[PDB]
Each structure stands twice: as C-alpha cells, then as structure tokens.
C-alpha cells in the first residue's frame, strides 16, 4: 500500500493567518490526491480534488498544490469555522489510503476560566457513591491544572477530566473534573475544594463548599 | 441535495455480525459507485472497499476481505455493509460515501462488546450558595454503550450549554456532565435536562432545583 | 392469627357492577358465618347482610336487597360480595367480618377485614405528580427542620406514602387528601426532625397509587452545604 | 328497624380520666348489644359483647353495662392509644343497626404550632401551576387560623386545608394549607406569606419568602 504521511499532526494559528498543511506519499502518486475536512462533529466534506481543484461550496481561501510525492493544502486567511482535522487521500493505486490527519485549532488571547464547584446530589449519595464536579468555563489556552483537596489533603488517582472541543465562535475550551468517592469516605470529611491553575489567573483560584456540619 | 443517511449506532457481540445501511437520495443511485471508510476512535481514515450498484461488482482492501461484505438494494437506493467475526478492533465509526469521495454519510458508531446495555442515572448539578452568570447541569452517569444525547428545556435552551465528551470510568461504564451558564439574575426560568439513551430505550427529564437558602 | 384479607381499591363506572373478595385464614372457613358492613366517608356503619359458608344461605338488610349479592368459594376460603347498578352513593368502604357465637344465641363480629374502598365515578384513572417540599432553614434558632412531598392531581383514592422505604416513620405526617375543584385529589406528606441539621440521612418519599399502577420515589434534596 | 343513638358524637378527656360513652335504643334490646372500636386508620375491632363481656386482648380498663334501652361503655383510665371512634350495635332484631359513633380525643396542655412555608418547585412550575404550602406542626388544640397574603393582599377562595387525626403519642394535630395559583399569577407578585393564629401563640406568626431570590 502507498503510505501517506502528514508530518505535522497538530497545528495552531491566529485568525487571519496563512496556514499550510503538508502531505507526502511513499511513492509518486501523479497528482491523484484529494483533501478532506472533518469537523469535531465527525462530519466529513471534500475540499480539493486532483491536487488543486475546489469542490462545490468551498471558499477560494482554500487552495492546493503539489506533484510527485509532495503536496500542500493552504488556507489563505484563517476563519474560526476552519477548526477541523484535514486529511489527504491518494487514489493512484488500490487500496485508497489516507494521511494521519492534521488538527487545526485557533490562537486567541488568553482567557481565564470561570470556576464552579458542585456537591453530589442526595439522590446519588443514597446509593453509596458521591460525584463532586469542578467546572472550568470558556478559557484559553487548553493547558490547565485542577487539584482536588479534601480537608486540605491533596487527592490523587480518584478523578477524571473531560475537555470540550474548541468553540467555533469564541475559540475557548471548557473542562470538567469529577472526583469520585464512596458515601462513607465522603461523610468522613467536611471541606471539598478544587484548585485551578491557569495562565489567565494571576494566582490559583479555589472554589469550595463544606458538607453541612 | 445529495444525501447519504446511515443507520443508527449499534452494540454487537464479539464473533457475531452486524449490517450497516446507507440510504441515498438526491441523485441516481445506479450512476455512482459507493465506497465505505472506517475510522477508529482518535485515529485516521481507512478505505474498506467499493461497490458498483448497477451490477454489484466489488473491490476490497485486502485487510478487510475476510471482514466486510458489501451489497445494494436498487429498489430502495440503499447500500449495505456487513461486518462478520466481530472483535473489539472492529469498534469504530463507519462511513458510506459516493465516488474523489464528494459526499459522505454522517457515520455509524459500532461498539463490539460482550457487556450488556445499561441506561444512565441522571443527577442534578446545583451549587450550594445562592457574577454575571450562574451555572447548573446534569450528571449522566453509569451507562453503556455510547451514545447519549442531552438537550435543555426540550431543545429551546442552547445558549451557554456545554455537553462534555463521555469518559469511560474504571467500572467500564460511561459518564458525562452537561452544564448551562445563564444570566445570574433566572428568576422566571426553569432548567430541565432531557437525556436520551437509545440503546437502553431510556428517556429521562430532570429539572434542576436551586438551593436557595 | 385470624385474618380476613380484602381485595384492593376499585374504581368502577355508574350503572356497572363490582365484586369484592374476602380471603380468610387462621380458622376453618366453613365453621363461621360471615357478615358485610358498609361505611360511607365520615359516616356510621351499616349492616348489609350475612352468609352461611357451609350451605350458602343468606339474609339481607332490605335496604340492600336490590344492591348486594353475597357468595362464597369454599375451595379458596373466600367470601365475595357483588354490588350492582352502581351510583355515587355506593362509593364507600366495605368490610367483611367473621361472626362468633357465644352462648345459645349471643352473636358478635369478632374479627374484621381491613376494608375495600369502592369509588363509583365516570372519570378516568390518573396517576399523581410528586413534587419536593424543600427545607428552608428560616432562622438559626430553629429547633426543627421540615421537608416533604406534594402528591398532586390523582384519581381515585387512595395513595400510600412512606419515607426511605418505610425505615423512616418518626416525625412523619401524611395529611388526608383534599378534592380539588378539578375533581382530582392532592395531599402532602411532611417530615420534621430535631434540627441537628439532618445528619448523614437523606429523605426519599415512596408514593404508591395502585389504581394507576404508579410507584414514584422522589429524593428531596437537603441542600445542606454552603460555599461562602 | 331499631334506631341506635349515641347522643354524644364528640368527646375529649385528659390522660388518666374515666370516660363513659352512651348508647340508647329506640326500644328494649334485652342486653343484645356489642361495642366496636375504630382507629383513625380505619381498622375495626370488637371491644365488648353482650353488654359486658370483654373480647380477647381488650385490657380490663374497658368495661360495659346497661339494660333495656340504655347502655354504657366505660374506659377507667384513659391511655393515649384509646383515641378512636366507638360504635354500639344491637342484634335484638334484624337488621343489625349501629349507633352513629362517638369520637374520643385527648385533652393535653396547649402547644404552639411550628410553622413552615414552602415555595413551589420549578418541576411543578414549568407545567403552569404553582402550589404554595404552609405547614403547622404538632399543636393543640385543633382550632387554628391560616391566612395567605400575596404582596400583603389577603387571599380568598384559592386555598384548601387538611388536618391530621390526633397523634397517638403526643396528642397533637398538624395542618397543611395549600395556596394554588397559575404560573402567570404567581409570577406577578413577590412576597408570599402565611399568617398563623393559634392559642399557644402570644401573637400571630408569619412565615414568608420572596419569589426570585
């Protein structure tokens, strides 16, 4: 099979910048190359066919060039809705093969997260488990540190994070962190706190509640 | 408009078979070849094979020759792909396409697992105390398989909504949170999350009550 | 122990008939006479009639001669009463009873069933909605906190309400239903506790409406946390 | 038919007092008279047969006497669990006939109600109706006045009360009052108050909340 490589897997650029995505083949494919866009939604659309030809509805800021083993997709001025993964595909020989893809995200100004903490419901708690949720809303960049404290004791190995895809409009991320405890363990302790470190914060923000008492 | 409508998500057991359908419209079915593509979670696209609807001739990627069987029904403009001898490695999204691959279906999620279906529990996320925005949500916990859909107020509330990607817990069940941020002053507004887990035929409406004392 | 187990509550339409059963145990069915009694809501007891299970002989209050028919099934130790040509005036609780004989001819109704509620109405069955009554601590100097469940818009009677699957009984007040102008019933069930907060205890009301086959568990959120 | 009369329909006495309940017949019944006890829950038990004989399990503080047309049931020292309705029944002639019954309640010391107000849930409110509940807990005597005020305007004809039977332990009553409004009407006004008058209160107690906050 013909190996298709996209040497850059991850890429970020500012709004209005010119972006170029690389695609290389293990042998000459004689311009038989297409480009696809996949949104975070999972929906796929054709951008370019036969190296340089535009598909219906594709704006002219998208263009493609290359020959032999090496090809390029260019986005002349980056709009927010260009957030996607871009895939090349050869049809020189069967089987058709795709590149590993290049994920494109936007550089914006730094934005501090709004932080919220949520105690477990009694409805959950009566069944023997407690989920405590810390929410970081609409921040940039993605890098963020969440630390759980229970009576000021740092927790480890009992939380999981989930992060949204970059928003198509404001180009921010949101993050949830869930601390899971037994009912018994939950009812030993009093103060529940998530501490957030992020670039947009001058110093770490703590949100906390006390479990009654 | 050209359109390819694929069948819904499916949980199936290892060693068994599954059949995915692709209902076309907006063009003459018999005039275009149909190709199928695989995408494993977090991975690239793989060409499975193609079928010529008019006669029924097929060509397969050698990697899928003992895996996939493609058929068509000309009377209903529908293409089918059957995957046999299923393993966990066959868990993926599968796309039908029209031949470049100029139009794509929305994808079908196949989960291969011997584990049973389980509907979610839905708990409220309400803050403890009574800024320009407050936050609330629903925790959708302990379901299998993917996916769940979450809406707010029967779809009338979309502004400020973040439904996080599910994470697989160590229990082997999925969990996610859906949160809303809304104007801090909310007095006249109620907030109800609508959770649908089709695999288990579960529909849950949970109104999130404020802790206002 | 002597026991008379009556059939569950029944909604039936005017002009129709209904059959109530009375399943006995703890004694020999054919050795004791059985009597039936009517009690309208807020009213006194009325004798309907009696039946001799061994042969099936009956005597009726003349007021119920065009109303009631009593039978027995000896194989299942069960007495039956059928009420025909139903009207709203037949809406009542009906009791089966055992008659004991003492001297020559001293008679009394020594054991009673728990009663069967018959509602005669053209209206349809409707299951309740269950809403929380959420505890707000109004002052710091509160010696008791209170929460509950509102069980609204059901028909017919009755509903049963328990707390924490029956494990919580102290401090519970389940009020009598009131008929709303809509023709549907509503009641509240409340719990009060000595204000030591609530402890590690949660509060779930269990609502059962047999006529509609509705069972609802509703956890009432305490909201016993604060950020500050 | 023989008319059986219990001239006293309602009776209250202190714990430890001696209570006598009367039963008269429209003609002589020659001692063919039984007594029954009905608890608030609706369960019925035989107390006395043939004027004076005790049924199994009936404590000896119960006794019965009489002849001809006039009969008496006596409770020698009143316990709290004697709260019930008592019925006489003749079997001199068919049909068997019962007296109208005598309800027995306990005299205790005056006890002020604890008052609580509950706003409507959002879960109810979204469906277009608002129920506001005022609770009066564990008071004596039964007589009590609840007035609803909405922005200090006395409400009329839009509430319903319910009162528990006397508690078998502490001999108190409780009362609920429900004010019912449309969602629209509810959302016109701000301050919701129930005002309680009772003998154990030095002056009327008002509990209130403001809607929104």
Residue numbers in the entry:
A (entry chain D), D (entry chain B): 232 to 444
B (entry chain C): 1 to 99, 108 to 138, 142 to 196, 198 to 225
C (entry chain A): 1 to 228
What does the published report state?
A promising strategy in cancer immunotherapy is activation of immune signalling pathways through antibodies that target co-stimulatory receptors. hIgG2, one of four human antibody isotypes, is known to deliver strong agonistic activity, and modification of hIgG2 hinge disulfides can influence immune-stimulating activity. Furthermore, we explore structure-guided design of the anti-hCD40 antibody ChiLob7/4 and show that engineering additional disulfides between opposing F(ab’) arms can elicit conformational restriction, concomitant with enhanced agonism. For the most biologically active variant, C232S κC214S, disulfide linkages between C127 and C233 on opposing heavy chains were identified and termed a disulfide cross-over (amino acid numbering follows Kabat nomenclature, κ stands for the κ-light chain). Given this consistency across four different cellular read-outs, we conclude that engineering additional disulfides to link opposing antibody F(ab’) arms results in a compact and rigid antibody molecule with augmented biological activity.
Visual inspection of the crystal structure of the upper hinge aimed to identify areas where opposing heavy chains were close enough to introduce a pair of cysteines that would lead to the formation of a disulfide bond to link F(ab’) arms. The amino acid K228 was deemed to be in a suitable position to target for mutation to cysteine, based on distance measurements. MODELER32 was used to generate a predicted structure of ChiLob7/4 hIgG2 C232S κC214S (cross-over), with the additional K228C mutation, to determine whether a disulfide bond between the amino acid 228 on opposing heavy chains would be likely to form. With the assumption that the original hinge disulfide cross-over is maintained, the C232S + K228C κC214S variant was named cross-over + K228C. As seen with the parental cross-over variant, the cross-over + K228C variant showed two species migrating at ~23 kDa and ~104 kDa, indicating dissociation of the light chains from the heavy chain dimer. X-ray crystal structures were determined from pepsin-digested F(ab’)2 fragments. Anomalous electron density confirmed that the structure-guided design process was successful, with disulfides forming as intended. In the cross-over + K228C variant, the disulfide cross-over between C127 and C233 formed in addition to a C228-C228 disulfide on opposing heavy chains. The designed variants are slightly more compact with hinge angles of 125.3° for the cross-over + K228C and 124.9° for the cross-over + T222C κE123C, compared to a hinge angle of 126.6° for the parent. Flow cytometric analysis showed that HLA-DR, CD23, and CD86 upregulation were significantly greater for the cross-over + K228C and the cross-over + T222C κE123C compared to the parent cross-over, as was B cell proliferation, measured as an increase in 3H-thymidine incorporation.
